[PDB]
DNA sequence: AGGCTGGCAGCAGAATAACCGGTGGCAGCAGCTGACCACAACCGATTTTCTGACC
C-alpha cells in the first residue's frame, strides 16, 4: 500500500510524507527501505517495508473515527490517580501509545485540568506536544486548513 | 636452629520533578491616637518716659 505520495502517521513524531523507496544493502540484500519527511524537526526516518506495522506506522484516518474522537474529546469522564507521578506516567503511556483516541483523551484531561487549575511547565510542554500531533494529524487527514484546524479544535474544546 | 648487624635499596619532604500543609514573616494601609511643632495671636507685667493737666 506504501507507494510514493502517501501521508502516513508515525507513532509520536506526527504525520509525514513519503518520497522514495530505498533498496539500501543490509547483509548483502536490498531490504525495501521507505523514507519519511516529517516536518517538525525535518528528520528523515527510514524503515523496513514490513516492520513498519510492527513499530506502529499507522495510516491516515478519514471516517467515523473522526466522530469517535470528537465524542472522546467532548466526553464527560475526567479521572486521574491521586499522585501526580502516577498520573503523569499514565498520561505519558497513553501519549506514547500512538492512538488518536488516546491522544484525544490526554489533551482533554490536560486541557480541563489546565483551565481549572494550571499544573506545571512539564505538563504544559506535554499538552503542547500532544495538541501539536493531534492538530497536525487531523489537518493533514481531512485536508482542512491547518490553524483552522485549531479553530475547530477551539470549537470542540468549547464543546 | 634463628638473630641482630651491616650496607643496600627505596621513599617522604623541603628549596629554588512535582504536590500539600502549615507557619511565621512582612508590607500596605485605614485608624486610633498622642506627643509635637508651630504659627499666631493675646495678654501680664515692666520699665521708661513722655503726655497731659494741676494751682
Swiss-Prot record:
InterPro entries: CarD-like/TRCF_RID, CarD-like/TRCF_RID_sf, CarD-like_C, CarD-like_regulator, CarD_C. The keyword Glycoprotein does not apply. It comes from the Bacteria. One of its GO terms (biological process) is rRNA transcription. Gene3D superfamilies: 2.40.10.170, CarD-like, C-terminal domain. Keywords: Virulence. Belongs to the CarD family. Controls rRNA transcription by binding to the RNA polymerase (RNAP). Required for replication and persistence during infection of mice. This is RNA polymerase-binding transcription factor CarD.
Amino acid at each position: 500500500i506504501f507507494k510514493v505520495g502517501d501521508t502516513v502517521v508515525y507513532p509520536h513524531h506526527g504525520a509525514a510524507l513519503v518520497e522514495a523507496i530505498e533498496t539500501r544493502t543490509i547483509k548483502g540484500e536490498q531490504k525495501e527501505y521507505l523514507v519519511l519527511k516529517v516536518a517538525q524537526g525535518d528528520l528523515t526516518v527510514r524503515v523496513p517495508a514490513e516492520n513498519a506495522e510492527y513499530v506502529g506506522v499507522r495510516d491516515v484516518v478519514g471516517q467515523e473515527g473522526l466522530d469517535k474522537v470528537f465524542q472522546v474529546l467532548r466526553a464527560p469522564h475526567t479521572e486521574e490517580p491521586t499522585n501526580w507521578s502516577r498520573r503523569y506516567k499514565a498520561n505519558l503511556e497513553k501519549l506514547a501509545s500512538g492512538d488518536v483516541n488516546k491522544v484525544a483523551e490526554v489533551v482533554r484531561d490536560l486541557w480541563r485540568r489546565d483551565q481549572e487549575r494550571g499544573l506545571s511547565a512539564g505538563e504544559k510542554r506535554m499538552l503542547a506536544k500532544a495538541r501539536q500531533i493531534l492538530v497536525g494529524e487531523l489537518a493533514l487527514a481531512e485536508s482542512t486548513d491547518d490553524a483552522k484546524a485549531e479553530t475547530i479544535l477551539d470549537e470542540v474544546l468549547a464543546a
